Design brief:
Inhibitor of vertebrate lysozyme, Ivy; dimer; alpha beta fold; homodimer; six-stranded mixed beta sheet; alpha+beta; 34% strand; hydrolase inhibitor
Chain lengths: 128, 128
């Protein structure tokens, strides 16, 4: 199955995944892609992506990640979120490296890691 | 017009607004609600809200806020975002005080302050 973890280990996707996280110092669990939500298909403008998410096993609500990957162009963008135990403040790290992400793409990644995308599989299609 | 600023000054909304921001030390511009996006109507489950947003004049992309207010119950929830000049990391502060916010409500507030809600006015209705 297509998960953040299989993308991180895949022969033809691993270097792209390593570039996406390059310089971001993300937790080991992301690559282990243990607890994950099934990939959903989302369309932005005139391109389609598989949007996936995953979170820290046994502390899922505290650390989570979302990735948007185009099976056609092999291109991927992501978002990492950590919630501070002390303030409940949420710190987001955008995994861009391409500067290709749009406002809707940011929203779709946030919907994925929060859980709205799973709850409304076809509610985040913004076609052109 | 209905804006975060009019809610902050309104006779019957100001105490609720002051409670929402209580203990959060937000910038002065929020109450001045200068640069704002028109209110949009959004339905979550079986309740409707006016979702509004605003941002820091002349540095709009750096500091922004979204608020969801029910004209019927006078209840409001919000989200403040600041983007670090140094890392581009985005820090979110949830204005809850009621613990009433759902996963979809978090998504709708994020869509509002990012701009997706304005670009897709009726694309964030999650009715029950």
């Amino acid at each position: 199955d297509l998960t953040i973890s299989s993308l991180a280990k895949g022969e033809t996707t691993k270097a792209a995944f390593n570039q996406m996280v390059q310089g971001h110092k993300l937790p080991a669990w992301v690559m282990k892609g243990g607890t994950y939500t099934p990939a959903q298909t989302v369309t932005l403008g005139d391109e389609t992506y598989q949007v996936m998410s995953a979170c820290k096993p046994h502390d899922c609500g505290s650390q989570r990640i979302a990735v948007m990957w185009s099976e056609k162009s092999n291109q991927m963008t992501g978002l990492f979120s950590t919630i501070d135990e002390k303030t409940s403040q949420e710190k987001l790290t955008w995994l861009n490296v391409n500067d290709a992400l749009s406002i809707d793409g940011k929203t779709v990644l946030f919907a994925a890691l929060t859980g709205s995308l799973e709850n409304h599989p076809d509610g985040f299609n913004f076609r052109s």
